Design a protein around this ligand. Sequence first.
Ligand code: 9N4
Lengths: 12, 230
Amino acid sequence: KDHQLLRYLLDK
Amino acid sequence: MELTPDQQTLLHFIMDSYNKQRMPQEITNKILKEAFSAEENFLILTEMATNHVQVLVEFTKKLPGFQTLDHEDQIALLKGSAVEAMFLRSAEIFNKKLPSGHSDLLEARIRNSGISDEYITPMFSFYKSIGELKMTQEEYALLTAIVILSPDRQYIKDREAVEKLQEPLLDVLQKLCKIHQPENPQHFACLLGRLTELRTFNHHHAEMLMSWRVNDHKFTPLLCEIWDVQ
Ligand SMILES: COc1ccc(-c2nc3ccccc3n2[C@H](C(=O)Nc2c(C)cccc2C)C2CCCCC2)c(OC)c1
């Protein structure tokens, strides 16, 4: 959950 | 010497991806139009930085071979480069040619934005050094890509995989420096020299944000993830 938004934008 | 058909393809692809960013005029017209309070300027900064990070993730994903990298390393590259890319883009925008008196007003308006004095001199020192290099759009685009694909980033598991992706971009940039500035054969080294200076802004970025002359320092959840604030 540390880079949740970043992981989401990277995967998408 | 001359670029190969593969390198031209690489260059044009990086250019098209780089051109998806918010136009320099959008930022400079707002600053030059009217003087804002430190509070209004902190909000302008925060929205500018949120849009920058979003567009940066999209530019980063298009970088040849980036999607083939380990997912944890992909996050580490994005996190390690976001602030440096932001300062490189601000340096580019700061140096865009404007009508007589405009760049002097832009500089004075950035000086009185709310940022602490301590951070004004190293920020403008970097902007003016970038400016003297008379960089083309292609050089800014390639240099941004090189900053993102830095193998020497902390928490990088597979440094070699990142190195393989950065090497073709360095080769293209070197050829471009030899073509754009043949009189200055130190130009490529000069450009890599600027990259080493960009890294210093990483260290005191959080303090230059928290020293802003505002009562409350509100950041978006995306900015908190990338800037390690709140
Ligand atoms: C952390 O402290 C600062 C202080 C000032 C700047 C800054 N240097 C600029 C040089 C030219 C043009 C505008 C410039 N900015 C701000 C801006 O929008 N930066 C920007 C961002 C954030 C993303 C993408 C692109 C840019 C340009 C204005 C924010 C609102 C108050 C006035 C400065 C800065 O940028 C990295 C960081």
